Every structure is written in structure tokens, then in C-alpha cells.
Amino acid sequence: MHCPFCFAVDTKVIDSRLVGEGSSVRRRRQCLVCNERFTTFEVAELVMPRVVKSNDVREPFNEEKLRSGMLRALEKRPVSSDDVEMAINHIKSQLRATGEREVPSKMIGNLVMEQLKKLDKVAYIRFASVYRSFEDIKEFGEEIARLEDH
Amino acid sequence: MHCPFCFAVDTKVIDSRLVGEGSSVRRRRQCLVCNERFTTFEVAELVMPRVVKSNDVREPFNEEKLRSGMLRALEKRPVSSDDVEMAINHIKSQLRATGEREVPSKMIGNLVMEQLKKLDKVAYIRFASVYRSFEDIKEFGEEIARLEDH
Amino acid sequence: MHCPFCFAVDTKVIDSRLVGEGSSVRRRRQCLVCNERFTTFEVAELVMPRVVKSNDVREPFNEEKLRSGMLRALEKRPVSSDDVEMAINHIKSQLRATGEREVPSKMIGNLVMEQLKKLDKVAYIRFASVYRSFEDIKEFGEEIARLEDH
Amino acid sequence: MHCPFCFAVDTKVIDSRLVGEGSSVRRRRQCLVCNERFTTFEVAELVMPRVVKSNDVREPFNEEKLRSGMLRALEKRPVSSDDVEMAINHIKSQLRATGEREVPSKMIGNLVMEQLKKLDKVAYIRFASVYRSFEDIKEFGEEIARLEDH
Ligand SMILES: Nc1ncnc2c1ncn2[C@@H]1O[C@H](COP(=O)(O)OP(=O)(O)NP(=O)(O)O)[C@@H](O)[C@H]1O
Ligand SMILES: Nc1ncnc2c1ncn2[C@@H]1O[C@H](COP(=O)(O)OP(=O)(O)NP(=O)(O)O)[C@@H](O)[C@H]1O
Ligand SMILES: Nc1ncnc2c1ncn2[C@@H]1O[C@H](COP(=O)(O)OP(=O)(O)NP(=O)(O)O)[C@@H](O)[C@H]1O
Ligand SMILES: Nc1ncnc2c1ncn2[C@@H]1O[C@H](COP(=O)(O)OP(=O)(O)NP(=O)(O)O)[C@@H](O)[C@H]1O
Ligand SMILES: Nc1ncnc2c1ncn2[C@H]1C[C@H](O)[C@@H](COP(=O)(O)OP(=O)(O)OP(=O)(O)O)O1
Ligand SMILES: Nc1ncnc2c1ncn2[C@H]1C[C@H](O)[C@@H](COP(=O)(O)OP(=O)(O)OP(=O)(O)O)O1
Ligand SMILES: Nc1ncnc2c1ncn2[C@H]1C[C@H](O)[C@@H](COP(=O)(O)OP(=O)(O)OP(=O)(O)O)O1
Ligand SMILES: Nc1ncnc2c1ncn2[C@H]1C[C@H](O)[C@@H](COP(=O)(O)OP(=O)(O)OP(=O)(O)O)O1
Ligand SMILES: [Mg+2]
Ligand SMILES: [Mg+2]
Ligand SMILES: [Mg+2]
Ligand SMILES: [Mg+2]
Ligand SMILES: [Zn+2]
Ligand SMILES: [Zn+2]
Ligand SMILES: [Zn+2]
Ligand SMILES: [Zn+2]
């Protein structure tokens, strides 16, 4: 970290302690050139990454939007709410594993599709019909044929 | 009617015309105090037969249940809200024409399918996949073959 | 209004009453052919047109965005909140008077500048500096010259 | 740092990198038990002199009041958030170099103007129009003249 006083590039960590019930790291740093001392805080970014929509508008990640889309596709299917919640938790872990501040809605959609393939193939076709915006009934056959290769 | 802008107690009807295939009256009103103009719609509020559900439980006719089911199927389809409202008016009209105190769920779903077959074929498949509760992915092709056959 | 029972094109209004604290008109209509009676409700359409942004993205009309921009321009200016609210009401009235489903944000901006020119000329220049996205300081004098005519 | 997901006590720092033009440390941390990965930011928290407002009331130094004013002036200007954060860090460094327990509002305003003069001249005029509370439109030209005289 650069010194906030003289802007020398190397600062030394002289002390460290956990704060905020172990969720943050409070440090004491010392400038090697101007010898000034200062406090720093290390805080995690726990909020989910923002979503870049199809029209390039950014909006905060909305877990209810993700879930309600899956529940429309899973209508009348033999998938428990625990299976859906585990699938949502897996999608959320993958989004966080990217390390990105923002992720395109296309990444969320692709991740939902993979979970739906494992959970219920009828639900997968229903979701794909909207996510891939089918304009002709021919597209159902094409999506099914693709699924039948794997 | 009171002015929705300045809350003056009387408004003058400046223009009137039949809309919704003669089922509604669209009016243009003008406030005599603030001179603002606005549009109003006059719609009938009729008694609808009760709905006998698949499990034989009776429940009142719920126009929102009818509408939301259609809108799920019509996602991203080029059908206007006016086309949907005309389809809903036609469905409600047919249920009323039976003269029955109650009508089965199946009759409503069947009537919706007739409308969706005229409005959008992709919507028809999406609705049929839930209404006819598809269990295998091959049921999409079979519904397509049947749809194209009538 | 057409009869919802026999579909005769003629129904006579036999009674009228204000409901919803004067905001709606309840009518009792009678078909001249089948003599059946039914109730109707007349309600106003208070929907501000959607906004077409500079990048062609549509978004609902947001009164707070409109006001927030004017209050930035009016900082430290002798214009009362009543003057601002009357200016906002006038802008909303003009957008509604277009009869359009959607209006470009450019129309909203032009309308706010028209109000700001009447309210406070300093505010007008401040708003124009962002609305017209000034890239050089010479644009302030250029905007003043344009105003110091009409 | 403790894992914010499973609450295991010692997350491993798997990556570290300077951000915000060297003023902050971005870390990537991994829990050794649940294997979840998350991002953290290390930022300095410095003691700052109190602010003596125009009415002689003292109030603690509020970085957000300083930043939000600059961001209003920098609207639609080609200045990155890193340039803004470096300007604020420079302001903070200069206020600390005075050694003063309290500093007048006027000193902060003048220091912001010196940074805005380097970052963007349009932003400088916008800020000056409110900071120097322009009462008439000729003050814009007068400020542009004093500015173009360095
Ligand atoms: N804000 C959000 N938070 C979480 N999931 C989202 C969000 N917006 C969309 N999703 C999900 O992202 C996936 C892709 O959505 P999709 O509708 O294709 O994208 P979009 O950017 O919303 N485009 P469009 O609907 O065409 O305007 C679906 O699983 C959505 O439910
Ligand atoms: N109370 C209701 N009023 C109006 N339409 C309804 C009502 N209940 C269901 N519908 C519609 O009737 C059609 C058939 O619905 P469907 O789901 O097949 O019937 P159901 O009795 O609800 N059976 P199930 O959902 O399997 O328990 C669809 O268009 C529904 O939206
Ligand atoms: N959704 C909205 N509802 C109401 N007023 C709005 C809305 N969006 C923008 N405005 C106002 O419309 C006027 C023009 O805004 P302007 O910033 O030029 O448009 P824009 O489409 O947002 N472009 P940009 O900001 O460059 O991406 C201003 O008075 C805005 O405050
Ligand atoms: N408490 C504060 N901490 C840090 N910066 C501040 C604070 N208060 C004001 N500023 C900034 O100081 C500069 C001068 O603000 P200015 O508005 O001229 O001062 P003031 O005392 O708030 N006067 P006034 O707003 O007229 O009551 C601007 O950059 C403000 O954003
Ligand atoms: N009728 C449906 N059947 C099956 N899946 C559906 C249906 N409607 C939506 N989904 C699924 C697939 C879509 O890509 C996904 C998201 O739909 P969408 O209506 O775009 O909402 P969203 O969550 O992306 O929010 P937004 O309204 O901001 O676009 O949900
Ligand atoms: N994901 C979907 N895609 C397309 N159409 C759908 C979808 N989900 C529902 N629909 C349509 C077809 C269904 O037969 C119809 C009604 O669905 P359903 O969930 O049973 O509600 P409903 O209106 O019958 O109420 P209830 O909850 O009382 O059963 O809506
Ligand atoms: N610093 C400012 N001084 C004066 N007027 C301003 C200032 N910032 C914004 N405004 C005015 C002029 C702008 O054209 C108008 C709208 O600004 P903008 O930030 O684009 O917001 P908006 O209301 O259009 O929403 P959005 O964030 O969706 O673009 O507000
Ligand atoms: N519309 C604007 N355009 C450009 N810069 C602006 C605008 N509004 C405010 N600023 C800048 C210049 C002002 O001197 C500075 C501070 O504004 P002000 O509203 O006084 O807040 P402040 O940060 O001093 O807090 P306080 O509310 O305590 O006075 O921000
Ligand atoms: Mg979407
Ligand atoms: Mg049902
Ligand atoms: Mg804008
Ligand atoms: Mg102030
Ligand atoms: Zn130093
Ligand atoms: Zn009125
Ligand atoms: Zn009749
Ligand atoms: Zn863990």
C-alpha cells in the first residue's frame, strides 16, 4: 500500500488484529520514507456481483428473480425445494468464484440451464424456450435434439 | 368524476368512443378548474361462474389466475396486451354463455388453448407443457405434431 | 356499450353514482333488446408515458429523477419548493398531453430547461452544462449568448 | 480473517494486488474448510481535522460530503473514479500536512477547486457556480476568465 501522506510506494505492516467479530482485519502501517503511522481496514465484499443485463443496464443481483424463473420452469415437476435451494447456492458460489464485480445475465442463465439439465429435462426445455427466446415451434425440436446428443 | 390532478369535484366529458370490440367505453374528460385532460375506461363487472378445480374444490373465478398463466406462456412473444385482453374477454364471455353456476378448470384451460392457438404457437406449446403436465421431453414434439394437425 | 349477455350494440345508462371518493363512476346499464341489467365502472388511466433514454433503453417515468436533476441546478437559488412543484406538475402535464405511450428523455430535458429559464437563469446554465454535456469552458458563454436572445 | 460463509477461523490469502493507483490492497481469500473464495479491500482510515462551517459550527470531516460535491461537478466528464479518489487522497494529505485540529470549509472548497482545475475545467466551473454562489449569469464568464488566468 502507498503512504497516504507522502505517496511513497512501500509501506510496512507494523501490527495486525481481527475486528468486527473476525470479519475484518485492522492493521497499523508505517511509511518507510516519511515514518508516519496510520490505520487500515481490510473488509470483504460479501454482496453478490451486479448483473449486466441484455441492454447493458447494471442492476444489483436479485435472488428472487433467479429463483422465480426456475420455479416457472419447474412447474408440476418432481424436484424438491431443497434441490432448488442447493442449485441456487451452487449458482451463487460460481458467480462469486469468478471474482468479478459484475457478471452478465447470460452467465446466470447458462448456470441455471446446467442445474435444470441435472434436475429436470422438461423444466430445462421450458426455461430454454424463454431464455433462448424461441420464435418458431421448430426450435423446441432443435433444443431437444441438442439435449439428446449429450 | 373528480379531477385526479386538482381534485375539483366535477369533470366534463369532451369525447366518447367504443373500444375493446364494443365491450368498453373510452372517454376523454376535462377539468373545468385546472383545464387538464385525461382518459377513462368504462368496463362491465359481471357475475362469473365458480371454478371446479381438479381436486373438486370450488373457488371463485379469478381473472388474475387466468391472465398470469397466459402471460407466462406469452413471455417475449409479439402479442399486444390488447390481444391478450380481447382473448380474456372472449374466454369470460364463453364461460358466462354456459349459464352454469360453476364450470370445470379443464373448460378454462381448453378455452385458453384455443386463444393461444390463434395468438402465438410458441405460447401454446409453453402453456400445453404445464396444462398437460409433460413428463418426458418427447412430449414437446408430440404436442407440436398435434398442434400442426388442427 | 354492447350488451355482455345478448351482444346487442345498444345499452342505455339507467343509473349513475360516484364511488372511490369521487375518483370512479359506477353505472347501471340496461340492454334494450334482452332487458338485462349490469354494472360498469369508469376509471381514469393515470399512467405517465415510459421514457426512451439516450441509448434507446425504455424505463418507467421516475418523478424523483426529474426533481433530483432540477434541485442540483437550483442549489442556493431563491426558488421555493412550491415553484419547483408547479414546474414539475407543468412538465408532467405536457408529457401527458402528448398522448404517447413513451417519450424520449430529450423531451423531458427540453421541458425542464424551459421551466428553469423562467425560474432562475443560473440554474438553467447549470442544468444545460450537464444536459448538453459541455466539453469546453467556452460552452458556458456560448449557452449564455443563446439565452441572451430568447 | 474468519470465513464469512462457514465461520472457519483462518482464511488463506491466495492473491494480492494494488488497486486505486496504489492507495488500496485488493486481496483474494480462500477458506481452507469450505473452499469458498471472496474478495477483500484494504483501505486507510485517517484522523482528519474538524471542519469549521460558514456559520462557525464545527463538524467532523465527512469524506462523503467532499466526494458527492465533486461527483456533481464531474457529471459526464472523462475523469475515472481512480482520479477522483487520488484527488481526495491528495486533499486529505494536504489537510493533514497543515497540522491543524480544525480547518475552515473555505480551505476544503479551495483545495477541491485546485484538484478540479487539474482534472476537468468544466467540472471546476460547475463546482465554482455553487461554491461561490453565483447570483447572475455574468459570473460564469467572470469565473472562466479568472480560471484561464491560471
Ligand atoms: N438482477 C438479477 N439478479 C439475479 N438473477 C437475474 C437478474 N436479472 C436476471 N437474472 C437471471 O439471469 C438469467 C438470464 O436472464 P435473461 O432474462 O435472459 O436476461 P436479462 O438481462 O434479464 N434480459 P431480458 O429479459 O431479455 O431483458 C435468468 O436466470 C434470470 O432470472
Ligand atoms: N379460480 C380460477 N379462476 C379462473 N381461472 C382459473 C382459476 N383456477 C385456475 N384457472 C385457470 O384454469 C386453467 C386450467 O388450470 P389448471 O391448472 O389445469 O386447473 P386446476 O384445477 O388449477 N388444476 P391443478 O393446478 O393441477 O391443481 C388455467 O388457465 C388456469 O389459470
Ligand atoms: N426515468 C425517468 N423519468 C423521468 N425523468 C427522467 C428519467 N430519466 C431521465 N429523466 C430526466 O430527463 C431529462 C433528460 O435527462 P438526460 O440525462 O439528458 O437523459 P438520459 O436518457 O438519462 N441520458 P444519459 O444520462 O446521458 O444516459 C432530465 O431532466 C432527467 O432527470
Ligand atoms: N464536514 C465536512 N467534511 C468534509 N468536507 C466538507 C464538510 N462540509 C463541507 N465540506 C466540503 O467543503 C467544501 C466547501 O463547502 P461549502 O458548502 O462552501 O461550506 P459550508 O460550511 O458547508 N457552507 P454552506 O453550505 O453555505 O452552509 C465543499 O467541498 C464541501 O463538500
Ligand atoms: N413461462 C416461463 N416458463 C419457463 N421459464 C420461464 C418462464 N418465464 C421465465 N422463465 C425463465 C427463463 C427466463 O430466461 C428467466 C428470466 O425471465 P425474465 O422474465 O426475463 O425475468 P428476469 O428474472 O430476467 O428479470 P427481468 O424482468 O429484469 O428481465 O426465467
Ligand atoms: N411456466 C409456465 N409456462 C407457461 N405457461 C404456464 C407456466 N406455468 C403456468 N402456466 C399456465 C399453464 C397452466 O395450466 C396454467 C395455470 O397454472 P397453475 O400454476 O396451475 O395456476 P392456476 O391459475 O390454475 O392456479 P392454482 O395455483 O390454483 O392451480 O398457467
Ligand atoms: N451537477 C449538476 N448540476 C446541475 N444540473 C445537474 C447536475 N447533474 C445533473 N443535473 C441535471 C442535468 C442533467 O441532464 C439531468 C439528469 O442527470 P443524470 O445524472 O443524467 O440523471 P437522470 O435523471 O437522467 O438519470 P440517469 O442516471 O438514469 O441518467 O440533471
Ligand atoms: N449542482 C452542483 N453542481 C456542481 N457542484 C455542486 C453542485 N451542488 C453542490 N456542488 C458542490 C459545490 C458546493 O460548494 C459543494 C458542497 O455543497 P453543499 O450542498 O454545501 O454541501 P456540503 O458538502 O458543504 O454539506 P452541507 O450540506 O453540510 O453544506 O458541492
Ligand atoms: Mg430477463
Ligand atoms: Mg391450477
Ligand atoms: Mg440521464
Ligand atoms: Mg456546504
Ligand atoms: Zn510517507
Ligand atoms: Zn383539475
Ligand atoms: Zn342484451
Ligand atoms: Zn468457509
Author numbering:
A (entry chain A), B (entry chain B), C (entry chain C), D (entry chain D): 1 to 150
Reported in the publication:
NrdR is a bacterial transcriptional repressor consisting of a zinc (Zn)‐ribbon domain followed by an ATP‐cone domain. NrdR binds specifically to two “NrdR boxes” upstream of ribonucleotide reductase operons, of which Escherichia coli has three: nrdHIEF, nrdDG and nrdAB, in the last of which we identified a new box. Tetrameric forms of EcoNrdR involve alternating interactions between pairs of Zn‐ribbon domains and ATP‐cones. Our results, in combination with a previous structural and biochemical study, point to highly flexible EcoNrdR structures that, when loaded with the correct nucleotides, adapt to an optimal promoter‐binding conformation.
We present crystal structures of EcoNrdR–ATP–dATP and EcoNrdR–ADP–dATP, which are the first high‐resolution crystal structures of an NrdR. The structures reveal considerable flexibility in relative orientation of ATP‐cones vs Zn‐ribbon domains.
